[PDB]
Amino acid sequence: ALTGLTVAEYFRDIEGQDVLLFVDNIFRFTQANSEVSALLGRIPSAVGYQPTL
Amino acid sequence: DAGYVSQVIGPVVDVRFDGELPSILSSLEVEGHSVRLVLEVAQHMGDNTVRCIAMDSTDGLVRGQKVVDTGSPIKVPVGRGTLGRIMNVIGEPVDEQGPIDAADIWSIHREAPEFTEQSTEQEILVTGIKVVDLLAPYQRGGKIGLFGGAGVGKTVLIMELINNVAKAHGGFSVFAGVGERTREGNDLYREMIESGVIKLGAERGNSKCTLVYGQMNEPPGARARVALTGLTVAEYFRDIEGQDVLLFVDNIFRFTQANSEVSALLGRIPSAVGYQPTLATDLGGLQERITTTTKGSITSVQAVYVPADDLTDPAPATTFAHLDATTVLSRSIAELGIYPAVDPLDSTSRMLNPNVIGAEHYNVARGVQKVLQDYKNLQDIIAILGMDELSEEDKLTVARARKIQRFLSQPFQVAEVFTGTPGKYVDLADTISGFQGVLTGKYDDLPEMAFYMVGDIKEVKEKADKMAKDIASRKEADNKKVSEELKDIPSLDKLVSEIKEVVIEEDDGLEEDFKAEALSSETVVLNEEGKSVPLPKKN
Amino acid sequence: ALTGLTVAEYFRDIEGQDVLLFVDNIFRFTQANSEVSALLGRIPSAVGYQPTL
Amino acid sequence: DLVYRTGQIVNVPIGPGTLGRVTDGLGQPIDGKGPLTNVRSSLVEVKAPGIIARQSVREPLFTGVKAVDALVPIGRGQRELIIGDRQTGKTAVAIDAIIHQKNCNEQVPKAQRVYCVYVAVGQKRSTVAQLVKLFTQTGAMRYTIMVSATASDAAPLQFLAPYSGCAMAEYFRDTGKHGLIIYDDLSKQSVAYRQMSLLLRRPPGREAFPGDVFYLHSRLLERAAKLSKELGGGSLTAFPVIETQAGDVSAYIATNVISITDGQIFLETELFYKGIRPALNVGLSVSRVGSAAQFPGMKQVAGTLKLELAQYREVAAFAQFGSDLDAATQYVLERGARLTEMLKQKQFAPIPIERQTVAVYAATKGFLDKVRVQDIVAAEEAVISQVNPAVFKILKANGKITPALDAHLKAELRKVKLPGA
Amino acid sequence: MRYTIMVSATASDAAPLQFLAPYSGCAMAEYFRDTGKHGLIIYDDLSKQSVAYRQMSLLLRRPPGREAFPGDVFYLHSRLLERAAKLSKELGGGSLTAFPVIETQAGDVSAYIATNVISITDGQIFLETELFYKGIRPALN
Amino acid sequence: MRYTIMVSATASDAAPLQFLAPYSGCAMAEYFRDTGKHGLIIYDDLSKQSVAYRQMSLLLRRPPGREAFPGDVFYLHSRLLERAAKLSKELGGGSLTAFPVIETQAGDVSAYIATNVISITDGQIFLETELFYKGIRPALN
Amino acid sequence: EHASRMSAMENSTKSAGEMLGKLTLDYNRKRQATITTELIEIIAGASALM
Ligand SMILES: Nc1ncnc2c1ncn2[C@@H]1O[C@H](COP(=O)(O)OP(=O)(O)OP(=O)(O)O)[C@@H](O)[C@H]1O
Ligand SMILES: Nc1ncnc2c1ncn2[C@@H]1O[C@H](COP(=O)(O)OP(=O)(O)O)[C@@H](O)[C@H]1O
Ligand SMILES: [Mg+2]
Ligand SMILES: [Mg+2]
């Protein structure tokens, strides 16, 4: 999702446009960051998400 | 050669071996303990240390106490010499009939046989129970599970199975009491002396049952391996003697529970609901040994405690896949008073294929499950409105299914000591015909409480005319000289002189035998020589 | 809650008379020990409280 | 500081010198009557007696509570859990069991007496001093030991007081006499065991409890056994008390002790406020010894009582429509309600078992059908106080309602006046 | 904005910066409380301060409690909202008025952080979602 | 079984073997997908692979997540089930279609492994147990 | 009677929809609290060993 932003941020900051960023299933962005906090040993917050949710 | 105790945390001992560690599952004997303390090596800790689970209590273990390796796992007596005896987890007699004859001394740890020696032969086991033989018939040679919470009747149902199946059976039986009450292990023992299943003394070889007990008082090391000891006695009859064995395991939930009581102390971070990470693999490695191979047959009956009636708990939910016939016992059925409280729409058998039991048995089983699921679907209305809005299309399927719920109930031979009604053994041909009749309408006019607690379909007609006799008894049995003071009874002033007045001593007989001991008020401690001195005034 | 108890214990034990001790939120004694015991190096009990509750 | 080993695994004074005394969780007496005199020091963690050491539970243990001497009968040697919520009658059921033994120890020989042990774990000293004031006012202290590890005591003392109390009560079991131990708040023992184990850094499990909190309670409760005739024939009857939270018996310690004990006396907080006191839930209450150790005569009338209360419970959730009369359900909707208010009982007054089975006979045979539902507790006084008191003298001796008695006491409950007309 | 300070710790800022900005804002408003003047403070979403503080506690490997919150998440808001006082005449007579904002989930006022602040603050302005969609705005319960 | 392979890691088998058996069967099934034929694979009890992978992870001291599953238990099932594909005509046009089998507990499909595999696959076949005893067999809800 | 039964069951379907609405919200709180409770007990047991 950060890679899709960075392509979209070039069209805003250099090309000076109005960009549409489609993040297909933002929940899967949440749950993939929830997995990398579990892999770095971080203690999860409430219902199971990362402490940095 | 020997090892010494380095760490004791509850029922878990670390033993240190300066050179030549024992293998995992090996049995160790602690030298100098009062009772025979046997440790079984669970894991190699890493610095010439093994971690063990103790088969008895560890109170009295000293760091540095010598531990002797036996070079083998826990070895128990097997063979004909164990029939009629009560064995320990470590193969010791606790029946006080002397030492045990040994046809062999087998290890309790084994591998499951193979895929190649599997017997793919489904044949019925006629139990004698109506709800069992109809809706979930048991397999001769397969694994049977009686699921239920506390107080629904798994111990009674396994007592009815012991005297309906193992009583008339050609091979031998093993009862592995795994972590249940010690009282009902003494109940099962004395039931089998008087029934002749266990013959004491000089008739000991004529016994047809081996008891292995690992009951609730014992530490979690004992309750985790006593199912393996009871299996080894049945695996000797299956492999070496090549015969049809019966293995009744009371509360296989306690095998998984006793592993859970030590596993945090074995260095394992916890899994889900409180269980060990190795829950399915501990349970799997035991249950794959209780199989009918090509040599012999082990028909196993396993009571499974279901904690707080929650079948979604992982210890009952893992052992569903290890079974051929699951007999889920329900608290809801027992609140109606229907016994055995077998849930008809939760009990499943692999034997309910019409290729195996035939289509005439299959349709009265599927038809009873159809009419009982429909009644469950109709209780959303007829427990709110009151059986008036159904236009007699499915008013009749309620009164067909309500007679079916009582007809699944059955008196037990072992419940004669509980309830005042005789035991009823029903043949399989009778329970198909009696349940086809209520399913189709051959018995549509008999009342529903004439079906309750009866043997077969001749006993519902023998109960229905007894009900319509004794309704008419309640119109003249009271007076007009049949219950008079003068007819057949004495007077009340005389009967108090009849009874023998027992002697009350009011002195209770306590200290007339008691050998006392003087209590030291001051604390008595040990100095460096080990001598019991007073505690010093140095503070 | 121990300081206010000690004042009430003096009037009971030494002065020997009936006293009233109103303690507003004795839960905040329990909650305060549960904040400290996270830092006293302890395995937490049930819901997150101290083992010695 | 220096730590000296004593050479001893943990001991308590057992013997006949503990009867009448209030001790702490380690055996030191806290009642201020001096040291224990006629005692000896036995171990605290004793192995439970095995399969051969026991025999079947046949003789009953009368509680004096009518809802448990009839519905949930208890034998000498069984383990009956009293489980319920807070302030629902758990201690009161257990206290009535202790008080009743004083009323029955004066009427039996020396080999039939029951010596109670009350283990009070994690309560106040105000509550325990109320009990010793009660057990002295009744006279039950000459048969009672009081082992008291209160809330100010250390968590190892509240962990050991059930075991230290059982070792005192095992003196009577092992010498041919009969014991009755009541572990009040076995839920508070496991809280003390959890604390003691989390500080020893043993890793926690469900609700932070240790892994061996089942073996904490099974090795305690399996010591309540009815011994065989080779071992004196003594018995120990345990009454563990487990407190639930909002009726949740699926909790970890409640599910452990429910599966250990034989029976369970489940008390509800909604039945308690319907006036049903003792608040026994008849559906969930079980006794796995059952009617094998019931008083005969009471056993003859309990079948009519257990069956009619089974129909009275299913006719309920239809009882909100008194416009909807049926006169067959309405027959049992009032008959079970005669039985429900028959089983009510005031506390600290246990009833003799023969006066109970006559009062259940008076409602199962329909003698109290004429009285209204609201005045049966006064009618049970009218049944008891107006019959001939020799009907109870020969029912206790014959042990069952003989054919020469059920027509005597048939007409005896007709010459009484019942408060309903 | 002639009279307003704006202390902003947005969603992209680090969690210790969102944890601190209620205290940074309260120190700026305590200047007016202590010099005899009057102050208003709005901590918009103390719901979000506690989530930033829950993040620091779980990354400090501290044992969590209700809804994985630290045991001192009460003291987080208690230490902050007690500084909104009305001082005596010997201290100047100044005052600080706080308006903490808490977002509930489905009308659940019995949440952990919600009930924490209800037991800290004096009053409560409960704004209802059923009155809000019926056009009644300010949707005061 | 002229066209069937059976990869069998049973219950007494080691938990690494039960974890590895879905991947071993998929590599046998990918021979047909890669050679222009068509495969069909049934992973019966994929909810028993995940318990086996949980056992190896907690014993290897990997940090647990919810229901004590490892953090890469979604990645476990997604890198297995995305191997079931329909290849393009330049890769032969072969295909592999998977049928993972998840056992729920009283229909709770909000459980952790059932939620993960529902996200991965292209649809469920539900089989209710109330429809099962209602005579509807196959009990497809 | 049929029009009163049509209006007594539009008040009852309404009231059993507001009661069900308050039951699914309370179940979803107990669902979320059960996962946090199970998780905290697993982390507290892993931190005691690691
Ligand atoms: N049969 C009864 N009739 C009337 N009151 C009763 C009866 N049984 C108990 N009570 C009263 O109800 C209250 C319940 O307290 P009880 O002694 O039963 O303790 P408990 O609820 O088991 O324990 P806890 O105090 O821990 O909640 C007391 O006031 C007691 O006197
Ligand atoms: N077939 C039956 N007939 C009558 N009562 C029964 C029957 N089965 C069980 N019960 C009652 O339920 C209780 C459960 O006994 P038990 O089988 O020991 O429970 P569990 O299955 O929990 O071990 C028994 O004490 C008995 O009162
Ligand atoms: Mg049992
Ligand atoms: Mg109490």
Secondary structure of chain D in the HEC alphabet?
CCCCCCCCCCEEEECHHHCCCEECCCCCECCCCCCCCCCEEEECCCCCCCCCCECCCCCECCCCCHHHHHCCCCECCCEEEEEECCCCCHHHHHHHHHHHHHHHHCCCCHHHCEEEEEEEECCCHHHHHHHHHHHHHHCHHHCEEEEEECCCCCHHHHHHHHHHHHHHHHHHHHCCCEEEEEEECCHHHHHHHHHHHHCCCCCCCHHHCCCCHHHHHHHHHCCCCEECHHHCCCEEEEEEEEECECCECCCHHHHHHHHHCCEEEEECHHHHCCCCCCCECCCCCECCCHHHHCCCCHHHHHHHHHHHHHHHHHHCCCCCCCCCCCCCHHHHHHHHHHHHCCCCCCCCCCCCHHHHHHHHHHHHCCCCCCCCHHHCHHHHHHHHHHCCCCHHHHHHHHCCCCCCCCCHHHHHCCCCCCCCC
> Which chain G residues contact residue D206 at CB under 8 A?
41
CA atoms within 13 A on the CB side of D302: 26
Q: Closest Cα to residue D22, out of D223, D178, D165?
A: D165
Largest CA distance in chain C: 43
User: What distance in angstroms lies between residue D246's CA and the mean position of ligand 1's atoms?
Assistant: 16
Tell me the DSSP string of B203-258.
GGGG--EEEEE--TTS-HHHHHHHHHHHHHHHHHHHHTS--EEEEEEE-THHHHHH
Report the phi/psi class of residue D391: left, alpha or beta, with left for phi > 0 and alpha for psi in -120 to 50.
Answer: alpha
User: What distance in angstroms lies between residue B160's CA and the mean position of ligand 3's atoms?
Assistant: 13
Tokens, residue D370: 């004429």
Q: Strand, helix or coil at B87? A: strand
| Ligand nearest to C-alpha D290 | 2
Please state, as a whole number, how many other Cβ atoms lie within 10 Å of the Cβ of residue D210: 24
Tokens, residue D339: 């039985």
Which amino acid, D402? T
Nearest-atom number in ligand 2 for the CA of D290 is 27
Q: Which residue has the tokens 């008339």?
A: B168
Active-site hit among D288, D313, D372, D414: D288
Residue E94 CB partners (closer than 8 Å, separation 6+): E32, E33, E34, E35, E36, E37, E38, E39, E87
**Torsion sign, CA atoms B511, B517, B519, B523:** negative
Q: Which helix (H) or strand (E) holds B124?
A: strand B124-125
Please state, as a whole number, how many other Cβ atoms lie within 10 Å of the Cβ of residue G9: 11
Q: Closest Cα to residue D203, out of F78, E77, B271?
A: B271
**What phi, psi does B483 have (nearest 5°)?**
-125, 40
B331 is catalytic: no
Please state, as a whole number, how many other Cβ atoms lie within 10 Å of the Cβ of residue B206: 12
Chain D, 89-148: which have a CB under 8 Å from a chain B CB?
A: 105-111, 113
> Which chain E residues contact residue G44 at CB under 8 A?
63
D288 is catalytic: yes
Q: Which residues surround ligand 4, an ion (CB under 5 A)?
A: D 91
Question: How far apart are the C-alpha atoms of F120 and F81, rounded to whole Å?
Answer: 7
Which amino acid, F118? I
Residue in chain G closest to C47 (alpha carbons) equals: G37
The pairing of strands E95-100 and B173-177 is: unpaired
Nearest-atom number in ligand 2 for the CA of B415 is 3
Q: Closest Cα to residue B435, out of B45, B206, B147, B130?
A: B130
Q: Which residue has the tokens 């131990």?
A: D181
For residues D122 and D194, the answer to whether their CB atoms sit within 8 Å is no
Tokens, residue B272: 């889900």
Q: Which helix (H) or strand (E) holds F130?
A: helix F129-133
Active-site hit among B167, B181, B295, B395: B181
CA atoms within 13 A on the CB side of D409: 30
Question: How far apart are the C-alpha atoms of D346 and D65, rounded to whole Å?
Answer: 9
Query: DSSP class of residue B425?
Result: -
Query: Which residue from E59, E61, E68 is facing A46, i.e. has the nearest CB?
Result: E68
How many distinct helices (H) and strands (E) make up chain F? Answer: 5, 2
In terms of DSSP H, where are the helices of A1-53?
2-13, 26-39
**Resolution of this entry, Å:** 2.9
Residue in chain A closest to G28 (alpha carbons) equals: A47
CATH topology of domain B1-73: Thrombin, subunit H (2.40.10)
Burial B10-43 (b: 16+ CB within 10 A, else e): bbbbbbbbeeebbeebbbbbbeebeeebbbbbbe
Nearest CA of chain G to the CA of F140: how many Å? 26
Please state which CATH class domain B75-350 belongs to. Answer: alpha beta
Tokens, residue A20: 């549409």
Beta-carbon separation of G47 and E61 below 8 A: yes
Please state, as a whole number, how many other Cβ atoms lie within 10 Å of the Cβ of residue D214: 27
The experimental method behind these coordinates is cryo-EM
> Which chain C residues contact residue G43 at CB under 8 A?
none
Q: Which of D83, D91, D131, D266 to mutate to test the pocket of ligand 1 (most atoms within 8 A of CB)?
A: D91
Question: How far apart are the C-alpha atoms of D319 and B308, rounded to whole Å?
Answer: 30
Task: Name all residues whose Cβ lies below 6 A of ligand 2.
Answer: B 148, 150-156, 339-340, 412, 415, 418-419; D 286, 288, 290
Query: From the CB coordinates, do chains D and F have 3 or more pairs under 8 Å?
Result: no
For residues D65 and D239, the answer to whether their CB atoms sit within 8 Å is no
Question: How far apart are the C-alpha atoms of B4 and B68, rounded to whole Å?
Answer: 9
Nearest CA of chain G to the CA of D207: how many Å? 7
Please state, as a whole number, how many other Cβ atoms lie within 10 Å of the Cβ of residue F34: 14
For residues D402 and D410, the answer to whether their CB atoms sit within 8 Å is no
Which amino acid, D212? D
Chain E touched by C4 (CB under 8 Å): no
**What phi, psi does B173 have (nearest 5°)?**
-135, 150
Query: From the CB coordinates, do chains B and E have 3 or more pairs under 8 Å?
Result: no
Query: DSSP class of residue E73?
Result: H
The pairing of strands B325-328 and B143-148 is: parallel
For residues D98 and D63, the answer to whether their CB atoms sit within 8 Å is no
Residue ranges matching CATH 3.40.50.300 in chain D: 9-294
Residues flagged as binding site of B? 151-156, 180-181, 184, 250, 339, 349-350, 353, 418
Measured CA distances, B454 to B407, B423, B458, D381 (Å): 7, 9, 9, 40
**What phi, psi does G44 have (nearest 5°)?**
-70, -25
Chain A touched by G36 (CB under 8 Å): yes
Q: Closest Cα to residue D299, out of D391, D379, D210, D395?
A: D395
Nearest CA of chain G to the CA of D189: how many Å? 21
Q: Closest Cα to residue D12, out of D212, D203, D194, D165?
A: D165
Tokens, residue D213: 């909190």
Tokens, residue D121: 């774990």
Residue D359 assigned to a binding site: no
Please state, as a whole number, how many other Cβ atoms lie within 10 Å of the Cβ of residue B216: 24
For residues B246 and B172, the answer to whether their CB atoms sit within 8 Å is yes
Q: Closest Cα to residue D176, out of D110, D86, D257, D85?
A: D110
Residue in chain B closest to F47 (alpha carbons) equals: B318
Q: Break chain B into its structural domains and give their ranges.
A: 1-73, 75-350, 352-480
Chain F touched by B354 (CB under 8 Å): no
Residues flagged as binding site of A for Mg(2+)? 24
Query: DSSP class of residue F89?
Result: G
Beta-carbon separation of F64 and G38 below 8 A: no
When scoring E59, E67, E104, E113 by the number of chain G Cβ atoms within 10 A, the one with the most, hence best to mutate, is E67
Residue D398 CB partners (closer than 8 Å, separation 6+): B499, D405
Please state which CATH class domain D295-421 belongs to. Answer: mainly alpha
Please state which CATH class domain D9-294 belongs to. Answer: alpha beta
Question: How far apart are the C-alpha atoms of E110 and D150, rounded to whole Å?
Answer: 34
Query: Which residue from A28, A39, A48 is facing F72, i.e. has the nearest CB?
Result: A39
Beta-carbon separation of G45 and B272 below 8 A: no
Nearest-atom number in ligand 2 for the CA of B184 is 18
Chain E touched by G29 (CB under 8 Å): yes
In this structure, the residue with its CA closest to atom 22 of ligand 1 is D90
When scoring D191, D193, D197, D198 by the number of chain C Cβ atoms within 10 A, the one with the most, hence best to mutate, is D198
Crossing angle for the helix pair B428-440 and B457-470, to the nearest 10 degrees: 60
Q: Which of B418, B452, B454 to mutate to test the pocket of ligand 2 (most atoms within 8 A of CB)?
A: B418
Q: Closest Cα to residue D128, out of D147, D152, D144, D114?
A: D147
Full set of structural domains in chain G with CATH: 9-50 (1.10.287.80)
Q: Strand, helix or coil at F98? A: strand
Burial D125-150 (b: 16+ CB within 10 A, else e): eeebeebbeebeebebbebbbbbbbb
Active-site hit among B16, B130, B154, B208: B154
Residue ranges matching CATH 1.20.150.20 in chain D: 295-421
Residue B438 CB partners (closer than 8 Å, separation 6+): B400, B403, B404, B407, B451
Which amino acid, D95? I
Tokens, residue E39: 């102050």
Chains that touch G (3 or more CB pairs under 8 A): A, B, C, D, E, F
Query: DSSP class of residue B77?
Result: E
User: What distance in angstroms lies between residue B418's CA and the mean position of ligand 2's atoms?
Assistant: 9
CATH topology of domain B352-480: 1.10.1140
- State CA E77 to chain mean position distance: 6
Measured CA distances, F24 to B94, B124, F121 (Å): 49, 37, 19
Beta-carbon separation of A43 and E64 below 8 A: yes
Q: Closest Cα to residue B41, out of B71, B19, B64, B83?
A: B71
Measured CA distances, D307 to B376, B437, B468, D71, D340 (Å): 24, 28, 19, 10, 12
Tokens, residue F42: 């049934």
Tokens, residue B68: 């002797």
Please state, as a whole number, how many other Cβ atoms lie within 10 Å of the Cβ of residue E2: 3
Residue E44 assigned to a binding site: yes
Question: How far apart are the C-alpha atoms of E64 and E81, rounded to whole Å?
Answer: 23
Q: Which residues pair with B67 in a beta bridge?
A: B3, B30
| Ligand nearest to C-alpha B412 | 2
Tokens, residue B35: 């009772």
Question: How far apart are the C-alpha atoms of G8 and D135, rounded to whole Å?
Answer: 59
User: What distance in angstroms lies between residue D185's CA and the mean position of ligand 4's atoms?
Assistant: 7
Tell me the DSSP string of B266-329.
TT----SSS--TTHHHHHHHHHTSS---SS-EEEEEEEEE-GGG-TTSHHHHHTTTT-SEEEEB
